[PDB]
Amino acid sequence: IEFMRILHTSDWHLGQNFYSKSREAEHQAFLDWLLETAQTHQVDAIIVAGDVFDTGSPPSYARTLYNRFVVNLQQTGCHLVVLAGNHDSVATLNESRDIMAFLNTTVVASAGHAPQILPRRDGTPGAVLCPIPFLRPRDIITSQEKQQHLLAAITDYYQQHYADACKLRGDQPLPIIATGHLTTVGASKSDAVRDIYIGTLDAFPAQNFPPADYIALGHIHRAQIIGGMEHVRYCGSPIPLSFDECGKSKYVHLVTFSNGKLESVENLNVPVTQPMAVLKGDLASITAQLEQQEPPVWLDIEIDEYLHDIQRKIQALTESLPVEVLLV
Q: How far is 315 from 172, CA to CA, in rounded Å?
């Protein structure tokens, strides 16, 4: 009878320079869809599980996309939780932390944020959130085996915060939601996923996560269930961030809680607004491949031996065609 609904997204990488192309149009369309989606499902909170911006110094149009979304989301009463990823600068996201608080937005850029009650739209307690962004080792390494140390440090961090979440919840029938931004053991990764904790943690075993009712992760671009646990998920990126991910579905997760427990996780397809394609073969295999649309499809030609000559060759075969070649 008491519901709480959140949307789980991550890895926006606003401002990404994609082979000289801007993703602004795609991100604008996505953010507009995310807005209508929040209204359609009467979502209580949207959680963005890290990598909001592609770098620590996003271009003005990306900062504008982000600000305008937060503003437009006000017409819904939906709360917004923005967590830093490894691509984000902490200082950059903290620029507007306190300003965002006036707009029902919680910006969490570094480790150490206490658990907080997420209200439902009507203001009553809906869930207890442990807002955990990408954890910089410097921020969590107690007493500042290095590999074993970081694993223990992250595990312990989640344990302390889960414990505090339980205390904050008290006797209330509220679900506990934790977030995270890292790479788990067994995760399937794409090209656009950058190595993190280089030399200090190959991957995080999801069995070490505390028993929150939902764990909303970011960093990995393909939506997947982790460690066979339906409550531990990457939502993946909302638009394709690399050519190896085109053709593949993009999602945000609609996560519903009933009486303090996880009820369902639904995969909401994010409309794809910019056609991309990857071509493999040789000059004729290529030539046949690219033959017979408002935006011009972006192309990754994975095609006589000197790759320099191949480029000029393809640059000839690709001229005045409704496509656009980005990578060779």
A: 65
Per the entry, the structure determination technique was X-ray
3 state DSSP class of 257: strand
1-273: which CATH architecture? 4-Layer Sandwich (3.60)
Side-chain half-sphere exposure of 257, counting CA atoms within 13 A: 27
Can you give the C-alpha Rg of the chain in angstroms? 21
Candidates 101, 50, 49, 60; CA nearest to 216 is 49
Q: What angle in degrees, to the nearest 10, is found between the helix axes of 24-40 and 60-72?
A: 10
- Resolution (Å units): 1.8
- Residue where the block lists tokens 């980005």: 326
Q: Are 274 and 26 in contact (CB under 8 A)?
A: yes
What CATH topology corresponds to 274-328?
Double Stranded RNA Binding Domain (3.30.160)
Q: Where are the domains of the chain?
A: 1-273, 274-328
- Rounded Cα gap, residues 125 and 81, in angstroms: 16
CA atoms within a 13 Å half-sphere pointing along the CA-CB vector of 76: 24
Q: What is the DSSP letter of 184?
A: B
Letter string b/e over residues 208-232, b meaning 16 or more CB atoms within 10 A of that residue's CB: bbbebbbbbbbbbbbbbebeeeebb
Cα angle, residue 90 at apex, residues 181 and 134 outer, rounded to 5° = 15
**Residue 150, CB half-sphere, CA atoms under 13 Å: how many?**
19
CA distances to 19, 35, 312, 326, 327 from 307, rounded to whole Å, are 18, 45, 9, 15, 12
